[PDB]
Amino acid sequence: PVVPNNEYVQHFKDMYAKIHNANNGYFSDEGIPYHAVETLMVEAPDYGHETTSEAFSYYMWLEAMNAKLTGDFSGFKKAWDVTEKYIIPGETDQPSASMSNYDPNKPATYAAEHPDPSMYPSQLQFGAAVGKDPLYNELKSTYGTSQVYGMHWLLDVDNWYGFGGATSTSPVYINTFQRGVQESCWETVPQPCKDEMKYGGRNGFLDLFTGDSQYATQFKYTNAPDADARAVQATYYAQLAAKEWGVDISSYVAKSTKMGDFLRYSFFDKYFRKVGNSTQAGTGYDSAQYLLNWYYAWGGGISSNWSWRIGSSHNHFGYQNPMAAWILSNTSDFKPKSPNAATDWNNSLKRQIEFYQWLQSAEGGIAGGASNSNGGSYQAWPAGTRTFYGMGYTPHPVYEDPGSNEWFGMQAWSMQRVAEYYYSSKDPAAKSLLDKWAKWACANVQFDDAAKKFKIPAKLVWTGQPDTWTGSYTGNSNLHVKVEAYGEDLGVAGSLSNALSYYAKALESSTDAADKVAYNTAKETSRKILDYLWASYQDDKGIAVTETRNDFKRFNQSVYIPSGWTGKMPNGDVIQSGATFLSIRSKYKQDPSWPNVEAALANGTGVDMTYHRFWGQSDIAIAFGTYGTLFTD
Ligand SMILES: OC[C@H]1O[C@@H](O[C@H]2[C@H](O)[C@@H](O)[C@H](O[C@H]3[C@H](O)[C@@H](O)[C@H](O[C@H]4[C@H](O)[C@@H](O)[C@H](O[C@H]5[C@H](O)[C@@H](O)[C@H](O)O[C@@H]5CO)O[C@@H]4CO)O[C@@H]3CO)O[C@@H]2CO)[C@H](O)[C@@H](O)[C@@H]1O
Ligand SMILES: OC[C@H]1O[C@@H](O[C@H]2[C@H](O)[C@@H](O)[C@H](O)O[C@@H]2CO)[C@H](O)[C@@H](O)[C@@H]1O
Ligand SMILES: [Ca+2]
Ligand SMILES: [Ca+2]
């Protein structure tokens, strides 16, 4: 098997070597990748040595590219082994006795989401409608268990919060976001996924978030569907390589298909309400939205046996993955064991591609998404709401502090998947979607050829709304995106290169003159991104550059705590009204970057940091490998 030998393949190999080099500090003792090498870091995780299911999926992807280029699959197997061991909840995390006591006719109890954290805890409404869960019985029959095989999104890799006790550095399942659209990462109260009431207040942390007349010890986990989908995508790339090299990784393929099987929960409305008629309880698949939603979650009792499951009514274009959907529905190797799984995924594939098209702005950037639950409490939609299969348009799904579609990264991450899907399937429904998107992307990459540097969009601003979906793209004349600021986010730049590489390669077979022009532009833009990354942005640990974090003023962000509510963090930090992000995370003041931060805050400056995010370094490496494999020039 003659593997490509050019400088881009070598750049990958060099990056791979840096990421795996012990001196650089990317991995924990368990072999778990951190969110970032640097500890003082807040953006979705709120500590740099937390990690995410996202990081695990990127780890898988990185190792898959390495296996493609070298024929060594040991690293990929290792990545899956650590995933299954540490981020997919096991027996002690989600007790089988509770999971087996699930009632698919009563999946959960309704509670409203609210526009501000001060309105929490939210009261459980036991009389409110909840639909039927149509997946549970099939999954249980297929796998012979009621337990869920999906990754939880957030892991405290070295027990930094101390929820695992005073003398442990073993990983701990934790969660943060609980209090709705206005709870930023600066406004949360971190909690253990297993709330045994050892920490927090009288009822642990539970009564900060949910209102009930009594509280029992319990576990609760939350999936990030975009990460599990990336796991499927990565494992597919690994499998192509495996057939090329004659290596058997079938049991790992089986892991990914099992995960993809459970990932179908991301197709469903939060409380299984009918799609487009959301005051009504669903009776099965009528509550299927068929996109990758913001999460599914599941939980249950520790001291006694009971359980619940929810989907999410909210959908963001940035989470979608037509590549994963295609893998699960239209390849034989990755047909999941559940009888209906491939069909469901095929329906999701079609729906996802329609979704990208519906949200494509006049300029070409993809707009936010859509929800089956206005205000997260099934409020009536305003007259004139623009819709997609009955779901109302939302410029910033789920979160507005900041808007969840303000970040340009969603554009790259998500369109990379469309591009890879398009290269793999040549689905014509994606072509114009990609053409228009690529032009916009390329128009917003600003090269400084003399310096061998560049900028790409950092923050996006949206106005207007799409035309309601009727089956074909309209050009969406009244839906607009503006680039408000540019920057040097190199991980995103890597992803963008990846997307442009697949798009160009997919156009390579076209004889149309305009396609030949688009091919040249996308390919050249990708190559220039990679060349400038390599030439100008290398440092000892990988490829990185300083970024300014003005948002770090929110270290002093007030955190809402109900009047009369008192509690403590494991380290003794007092939790009461008047709390701040920092007051309940005092160990941050022990961080080596802290003096610089507090000095910056002292003189009202923004904080300068140079970060090596595992996903960012991985996207960059993978972009090198991708360009090096698709274009053997
Ligand atoms: O407790 C006893 C009682 O439980 C009943 O059920 C309740 C349960 O108590 C509640 O906890 C549960 O609540 C969920 C909320 O409704 C839901 O909004 C919330 O959503 C969060 C999610 O927790 C969080 O992980 C998530 O994170 C994302 C980040 O935003 C992203 O940046 C990142 O990339 O990805 C993650 C996604 O993985 O944000 C979302 C949304 O903001 O989750 C709560 C639980 O975790 O509701 C249950 C039913 O309503 C039970 O029914 C009774 O029987 C029992 O007595
Ligand atoms: O939440 C999506 C994505 O966010 C990533 O962080 C971004 C952040 O959204 C943006 O505001 C900041 O300026 O840039 C960072 C990183 O480039 C985060 O790294 C991911 O974990 C997360 O999936
Ligand atoms: Ca550890
Ligand atoms: Ca807020």
Side-chain angles (χ1 to χ4, degrees):
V2 131
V3 157
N5 177 39
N6 54 68
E7 66 190 288
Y8 301 99
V9 170
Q10 193 59 53
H11 297 345
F12 171 88
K13 289 178 182 283
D14 292 353
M15 283 294 292
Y16 184 85
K18 282 180 176 172
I19 288 162
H20 275 293
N21 190 299
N23 290 333
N24 296 323
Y26 285 93
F27 294 90
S28 75
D29 284 354
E30 295 90 5
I32 297 167
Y34 293 120
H35 177 71
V37 172
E38 298 77 22
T39 46
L40 200 152
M41 144 77 84
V42 184
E43 60 194 19
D46 58 17
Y47 182 64
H49 285 191
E50 287 160 8
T51 197
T52 58
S53 57
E54 160 187 290
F56 281 95
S57 67
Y58 266 100
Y59 182 21
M60 294 171 187
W61 203 9
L62 178 73
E63 302 302 319
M65 181 58 73
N66 191 58
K68 169 74 179 294
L69 297 173
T70 67
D72 190 332
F73 291 75
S74 66
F76 180 78
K77 298 183 183 179
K78 186 173 186 356
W80 261 111
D81 291 345
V82 179
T83 293
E84 189 173 283
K85 183 169 175 57
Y86 293 109
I87 203 67
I88 302 178
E91 185 58 43
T92 62
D93 302 306
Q94 49 168 327
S96 285
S98 276
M99 299 301 287
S100 287
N101 214 35
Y102 184 67
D103 184 358
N105 292 314
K106 301 189 66 114
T109 301
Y110 173 80
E113 301 169 7
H114 294 109
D116 194 78
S118 62
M119 308 176 187
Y120 289 79
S122 182
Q123 285 306 124
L124 294 180
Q125 301 180 38
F126 293 94
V130 177
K132 298 186 173 186
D133 171 353
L135 300 183
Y136 170 72
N137 287 313
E138 178 177 55
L139 290 162
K140 170 178 159 182
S141 291
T142 299
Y143 297 110
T145 176
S146 291
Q147 287 181 317
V148 168
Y149 194 83
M151 302 188 275
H152 169 72
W153 87 278
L154 188 67
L155 190 66
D156 186 356
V157 180
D158 292 329
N159 187 33
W160 183 69
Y161 280 111
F163 290 123
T167 60
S168 173
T169 57
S170 296
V172 179
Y173 289 92
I174 59 158
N175 185 55
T176 55
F177 302 101
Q178 282 280 132
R179 300 184 293 180
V181 64
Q182 266 293 326
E183 189 186 49
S184 69
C185 58
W186 304 97
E187 287 169 278
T188 58
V189 180
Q191 75 259 10
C193 292
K194 288 178 66 182
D195 200 333
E196 290 172 287
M197 300 181 184
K198 303 180 192 177
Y199 305 107
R202 331 177 166 218
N203 297 304
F205 296 85
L206 299 164
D207 59 354
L208 290 176
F209 309 125
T210 296
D212 203 353
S213 50
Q214 81 288 12
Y215 296 91
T217 55
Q218 55 187 264
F219 58 93
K220 19 173 322 153
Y221 303 104
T222 307
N223 195 256
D226 62 324
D228 288 35
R230 187 182 296 106
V232 174
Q233 177 181 5
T235 305
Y236 179 75
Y237 200 74
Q239 174 71 345
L240 292 179
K243 291 199 264 185
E244 172 182 312
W245 287 95
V247 171
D248 175 19
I249 57 168
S250 60
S251 71
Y252 293 95
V253 170
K255 293 184 195 300
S256 75
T257 67
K258 181 165 157 173
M259 177 174 292
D261 206 349
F262 283 91
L263 185 55
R264 295 185 291 157
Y265 271 107
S266 74
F267 298 170
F268 287 86
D269 178 270
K270 190 171 187 184
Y271 294 105
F272 298 94
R273 297 287 185 88
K274 297 185 178 181
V275 180
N277 188 14
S278 63
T279 67
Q280 301 302 123
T283 57
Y285 278 86
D286 57 6
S287 62
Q289 300 161 170
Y290 284 114
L291 301 167
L292 307 191
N293 66 12
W294 196 255
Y295 57 88
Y296 66 94
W298 74 102
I302 290 168
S303 66
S304 62
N305 304 332
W306 49 275
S307 59
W308 56 268
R309 303 178 189 200
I310 62 183
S312 173
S313 305
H314 313 313
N315 300 274
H316 194 301
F317 92 92
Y319 273 31
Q320 307 310 307
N321 197 328
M323 187 61 196
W326 177 80
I327 288 157
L328 293 162
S329 60
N330 283 273
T331 76
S332 48
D333 284 347
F334 289 80
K335 176 181 168 62
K337 293 188 121 183
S338 290
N340 293 330
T343 300
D344 288 350
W345 275 107
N346 190 59
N347 288 329
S348 183
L349 170 60
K350 180 178 173 283
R351 189 66 65 82
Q352 291 184 40
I353 292 298
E354 294 176 74
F355 193 57
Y356 285 96
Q357 293 174 269
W358 177 61
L359 291 165
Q360 185 161 49
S361 66
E363 293 74 25
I366 316 299
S371 177
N372 195 45
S373 186
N374 189 22
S377 55
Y378 303 107
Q379 285 167 2
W381 293 105
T385 291
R386 305 295 178 83
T387 58
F388 178 79
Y389 288 90
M391 292 176 279
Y393 173 65
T394 56
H396 295 283
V398 191
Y399 293 109
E400 298 177 11
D401 189 5
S404 68
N405 210 29
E406 163 185 290
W407 185 51
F408 177 78
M410 290 299 189
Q411 303 289 320
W413 277 9
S414 194
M415 296 305 293
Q416 182 284 329
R417 300 156 194 153
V418 179
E420 186 170 358
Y421 166 69
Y422 180 55
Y423 162 83
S424 300
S425 69
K426 289 300 185 55
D427 180 0
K431 188 179 181 288
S432 292
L433 168 66
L434 283 164
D435 285 335
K436 182 169 181 171
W437 184 86
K439 287 192 157 78
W440 175 75
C442 291
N444 284 285
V445 176
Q446 302 178 339
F447 289 112
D448 180 338
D449 293 322
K452 290 192 183 181
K453 286 189 165 173
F454 57 82
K455 295 186 181 185
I456 60 171
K459 291 337 174 177
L460 307 175
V461 171
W462 300 87
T463 60
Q465 59 284 313
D467 298 310
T468 286
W469 186 250
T470 58
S472 38
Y473 189 54
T474 62
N476 284 331
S477 294
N478 297 127
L479 177 60
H480 300 285
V481 61
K482 301 309 197 262
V483 176
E484 185 180 39
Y486 293 82
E488 292 168 290
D489 189 321
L490 308 185
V492 173
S495 177
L496 174 58
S497 166
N498 188 334
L500 292 169
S501 290
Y502 272 108
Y503 167 65
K505 187 64 172 183
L507 289 185
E508 201 172 71
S509 73
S510 181
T511 59
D512 173 83
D515 288 343
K516 177 63 183 67
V517 170
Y519 168 86
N520 287 146
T521 292
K523 182 179 178 182
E524 162 163 15
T525 299
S526 177
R527 201 225 308 106
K528 288 182 67 56
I529 288 167
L530 299 179
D531 286 345
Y532 289 4
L533 285 171
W534 187 259
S536 302
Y537 294 98
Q538 286 190 70
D539 71 5
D540 289 349
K541 293 189 178 75
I543 283 173
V545 69
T546 193
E547 70 187 64
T548 285
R549 297 300 297 259
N550 293 320
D551 57 334
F552 281 11
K553 71 214 191 170
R554 298 187 80 174
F555 266 90
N556 297 315
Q557 165 76 54
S558 63
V559 172
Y560 177 76
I561 301 293
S563 184
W565 197 99
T566 60
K568 285 199 334 289
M569 299 294 282
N571 73 343
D573 289 341
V574 169
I575 308 167
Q576 56 170 17
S577 295
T580 68
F581 177 89
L582 185 60
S583 82
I584 66 173
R585 298 175 181 79
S586 71
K587 286 176 66 169
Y588 252 134
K589 295 182 171 182
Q590 304 171 29
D591 194 283
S593 293
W594 183 250
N596 290 281
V597 169
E598 75 168 346
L601 301 189
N603 310 310
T605 311
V607 181
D608 288 353
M609 298 287 295
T610 301
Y611 287 126
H612 303 81
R613 298 174 174 89
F614 184 83
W615 74 255
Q617 302 301 297
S618 291
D619 257 321
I620 291 162
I622 291 162
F624 287 133
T626 296
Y627 191 94
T629 56
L630 296 180
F631 308 113
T632 302
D633 284 322

